[PDB]
Amino acid sequence: GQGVVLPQPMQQELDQLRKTAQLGTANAAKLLGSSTLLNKLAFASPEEFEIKLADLERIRAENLKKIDENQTKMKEASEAADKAKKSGLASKIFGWISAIASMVIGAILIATGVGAAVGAMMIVGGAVGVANMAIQQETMKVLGPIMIAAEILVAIVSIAVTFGASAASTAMKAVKFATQAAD
C-alpha cells in the first residue's frame, strides 16, 4: 500500500494482545448465535450478566495524562461540530464525513467516552465486518441501514461483554438519541 503515508512507528505476545482485543466481539458473535430476541426488547436488560475499584483508581491515576488528552479530543470534536452546525460552513469542511461517523459525534455529545467506545466498535466492524465487506457488488441497497443496525447491535453486546452492562445500556441510549438528533 503506497497510497497512504502512515506515521513511522515510535512475536507471540502480539497474538495474545490481538486475542485480548477481539475477545469482546468473539463472545458477542457466540451469544448472538441463539434466538435473543431482543431484538426488540422491553427496556433493554437485564443482560445479564450470564455467563476491583482500587485497581481502577490506580490505573486511572497512572494514566491521568492520556485520559485528559482523550477528554480534550472529545471536547474539541464536540466544539468543532458545534461551531460547524451554527455557521453555513457545515458541509464544506465536514460534508465528507460519513453518516455513521456523524452519529458517533452525536453519541459523544450524549455519552462522551461511552459514545466514542460504541462508535469505534461500530466502525471497526469486528463480527459482521467481513460480511459487510463482502456486501460490495447487486441491486439497490436498503441492505445498508440494516447492516448498520446489525453492527450497532453487535457493538452493544460487545460493550456489554467488555465493560459494564450499564455501559452497554448507556451506549444503547447514546446511539438511540444520536439517531434521533440525526433527524
Binding site: G1, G3, L17, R60, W96, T112
Partner: protein, 150 residues
C-alpha cells in the same frame, strides 16, 4: 460495573483496562505498519482493527485502518474510519484527503470536493506539507471539473 462505565466514559480505554503498555501497543502498530507496506492489506486491516479497539482515541490507528480498507477497494468503510480519525485529530489533513479519494471513486463528487477542499486548508497551514497541499488543490480542480461535466 458502574465504576467500569465511569472509567469508559471519562476516556479510559481497553488498553488501560488490561494493563497494556505503550510499548507493547507500539510493537503492534509497527507490525501493522510493516504489513501494510508489504501489501498484506487484509492482515494489516486485522491488526489495525485490534489497535482501534485497544485505544479508540488514536487517530493513527484509524488512519491505518482506513488505509488498509482503501487498498482493498472497501471505499465506503474506509471513509467511516477516516471520518472517526478526523474527529480525533481535526488538524490532520490526510483524513479528508484520503476520504475524498475514496468518495471520488464512488462518484460522490460533492463530498469528494469537501474532502479535497479541507485537506488543502489543513495541509496549507503546516509548511512541512506543501506537496500534499498541492495534490489536494489539484484533485479539488479535477473534482470541480468532473462535477461540471455531469
Amino acid at each position: 460495573e458502574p465504576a467500569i462505565e465511569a472509567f469508559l466514559q471519562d476516556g479510559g480505554t481497553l488498553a488501560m483496562l488490561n494493563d497494556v503498555s505503550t510499548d507493547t501497543l507500539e510493537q503492534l502498530y509497527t507490525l501493522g505498519f510493516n504489513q501494510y507496506h508489504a501489501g498484506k492489506h487484509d492482515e494489516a486491516h486485522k491488526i489495525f482493527q485490534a489497535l482501534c479497539v485497544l485505544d479508540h482515541y488514536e487517530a493513527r490507528f484509524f488512519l491505518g485502518l482506513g488505509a488498509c480498507r482503501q487498498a482493498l477497494g472497501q471505499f465506503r468503510l474506509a471513509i467511516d474510519s477516516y471520518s472517526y480519525g478526523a474527529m480525533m485529530d481535526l488538524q490532520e489533513p490526510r483524513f479528508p484527503f484520503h476520504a475524498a479519494e475514496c468518495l471520488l471513486q464512488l462518484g460522490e463528487l460533492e463530498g469528494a470536493e469537501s474532502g479535497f477542499h479541507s485537506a488543502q486548508l489543513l495541509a496549507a497551514a503546516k509548511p512541512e506539507l506543501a506537496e500534499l497541499a498541492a495534490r489536494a488543490g489539484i484533485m479539488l480542480e479535477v473534482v470541480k471539473t468532473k462535477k461540471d461535466m455531469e
